[PDB]
Amino acid sequence: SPERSLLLKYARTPTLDPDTMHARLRLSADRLTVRCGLLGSPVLRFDALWQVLARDCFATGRHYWEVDVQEAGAGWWVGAAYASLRRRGASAAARLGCNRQSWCLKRYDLEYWAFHDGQRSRLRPRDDLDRLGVFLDYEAGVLAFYDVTGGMSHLHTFRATFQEPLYPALRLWEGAISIPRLP
């Protein structure tokens, strides 16, 4: 894929931050796979939503990472958020994509959605997404998502002026999400 090769010129492999992740979640030893444990159970740590943030954030320039939702079952949220995203409670200020501070794509059962700050946008991908590609252009204010499987097909592009650095960000309903290692 020349387009995938083009994206991969900015490849990132964002390790996840275990200090942030909800107590019900578990992180693999390489900090690249997050999964729901059987058993649930703190200041930085999400109180009530099954969310986790990456360790590293992005303040400038272009970046590309991928997110693999093939073991993630019927529900997931994949996106990016400022560090200012609230961690306590399940209010909109804490939920990924429900506020000024974060953007995400979400799958609920058969449905796919793009979320940002009261803006909502339904997606109609051809087949269930297995692999997502997230392309961030900080200067251009562009946060683009691709169906990696299925030919780098474009899913949705957010446009904003980013005020703070962005962290790759997830929310789990079930199963596992992994960050693939990129070139």
UniProtKB/Swiss-Prot annotation:
Belongs to the TRIM/RBCC family. It comes from Homo sapiens. Highest expression in liver; undetectable in skeletal muscle. The B-box zinc finger is responsible for inhibition of SPI1-mediated transcriptional activation. Plays an essential role in the innate immune defense against viruses and bacteria. Promotes the 'Lys-48'-linked ubiquitination and subsequent degradation of hepatitis C virus NS5A leading to the inhibition of viral replication. Also plays a role in the inhibition of ebolavirus infection by enhancing IFN-beta and NF-kappa-B activation after binding to the viral protein NP. Induction: By interferons alpha and gamma in a STAT1-dependent way. The lineage of its organism: Eukaryota, Metazoa, Chordata, Craniata, Vertebrata. It is found in: Mitochondrion outer membrane; Cytoplasmic vesicle, Phagosome; Nucleus. Interacts with MAVS. Interacts with WRNIP1 and PPP6C; these interactions positively regulate the RIGI signaling pathway. Interacts with CGAS; this interaction stabilizes CGAS and promotes type I interferon production. Interacts with USP14; this interaction mediates the cleavage of 'Lys-48'-linked ubiquitination of CGAS. Interacts with TBK1. Interacts with SPI1. Interacts with KDM4D and USP14. (Microbial infection) Interacts with hepatitis B virus HBX; this interaction inhibits formation of the HBX-DDB1 complex, thus inhibiting viral replication. The gene is TRIM14. This is Tripartite motif-containing protein 14. Ubiquitinated. Undergoes 'Lys-63'-linked polyubiquitination; this modification allows IKBKG/NEMO recruitment to MAVS. Undergoes 'Lys-48'-linked polyubiquitination by RNF125; this modification mediates its degradation via the ubiquitin-proteasome pathway. The chain holds residues 256 to 442 of 442 of the full protein. Residues 1-183 form the B30.2/SPRY domain.
